[PDB]
Chains A and B, each alone.
Chain A
């Protein structure tokens, strides 16, 4: 009980995201007739996530040339908004007073290649955010983390932990 011993006694001993058929009775009736080899009335798709990757009904190749700015050039022998930073009024104007219509067709495709890459990057990010919630939903996790349990339940195994004799 003395404080020379109390400090040493404890020292010596320390002691809307999927696109399946959500009815859980038409999927079973589909397989019950599919094993026979029969169609059914309703439709059933495979499971997936929602969302459409719709290109070419979106950002197009721009039209930097006029209706005849190439054939007339043929006769006369010639920070970011989406992916490109907005240029100042005076600095870009002398830059576009330098170029030639041999490079206008280059510039159109360069700017289209920037636009399509940004429009694929953001949709790719949204798609990864959707698949990370698909895989959690299909594995029993809710999101973002009389019943009878089967032996394949978390904590309901049949192989009980056997204890060693010294314990």
Chain B
């Protein structure tokens, strides 16, 4: 409010946060040396035991990004989750150290991107399964995904699937994160066993059994009983199943699900409707 007794008020904040002041030189020092991106799938899981928060959010992150300090982004996220200002004994340092560890283990897209890139890739088709819970809907679907192709876009396929199924949008940013998760956890298990990604010669037993065989002329149509797995099912669950899901070298057999704690947002599907209302009231009663 300007009609006052002539103070100097530097940066009257919106909500409780000071405005983000950029550098504007590191932005140009980074945006001009901008070869690649290398998105990182990041998983956050915490329980009421060994932790106090729950914080089941999953996000992508640019590994080559040296602009944003990660502790500032985590401190902005905890303020977005409406945690009160005692948020350091329920540390931002724990989440910051988890995200700092998860981007250090990310070995990147291997020699399929680094050294060579065969146009069309290889026959390495993997069996992607996903299991997403949003609100009271559960998307369960499996398909095949070539991990050996560089021009396979997970986001352009996630938008395509949520176009056909008319999904709200949490499934847009959960399907692509699941693709980026499982493709990376197969690439890491390939790279730690010394795969030498140009000449294939896969030569293992746990993998080469997860990989799918070569499609012949006859196998260009899948069998009918085998077809009923490769189809998207959006089941509806009630409060009992929702309470049952609320408690319960990389292991490629344990494929995690994407449950997310809801953000306190009014309009968006997938978030609780706490806070300021749609109608603009104050309700001064007598």
Contacts and interface: CB of A to CB of B under 8 A. Distances in A.
Contacts of B134: 46, 48
Nearest to A152: B280
A47 B285 contact: no
Interface stretch (B101-109, B113-121, B194-202, B263-271): B263-271
Given A131-B166, A138-B267, A149 B280 contact: yes
B266 A138 contact: yes
B282 interface: yes
Nearest to A108: B224
Nearest to B260: A46
A31 B274 contact: yes
Interface in B52-98: 52-54, 81-84, 90
Secondary structure at the A interface, as helix, strand, loop or mixed, is loop
A48 B135 contact: yes
Interface residues of A, number: 54
Nearest to B55: A37
B4 to A, nearest CB: 15
Interface string A38-63: 11000111111111111111001101
Contact of A45 (B135, B165, B168, B283): B135
A19 B135 contact: yes
Secondary structure at the B interface, as helix, strand, loop or mixed, is loop
A5 B261 CA distance: 78
B236 A52 contact: yes
A28 B266 CA distance: 13
Contact of A61 (B90, B224, B232, B269): B224
Given A46-B135, A55-B232, A147 B283 contact: yes
Interface in B227-286: 227-228, 231-236, 239, 242-243, 246, 261-262, 264, 266-275, 278-286
B145 to A, nearest CB: 20
Contact of B279 (A49, A105, A140, A151): A140
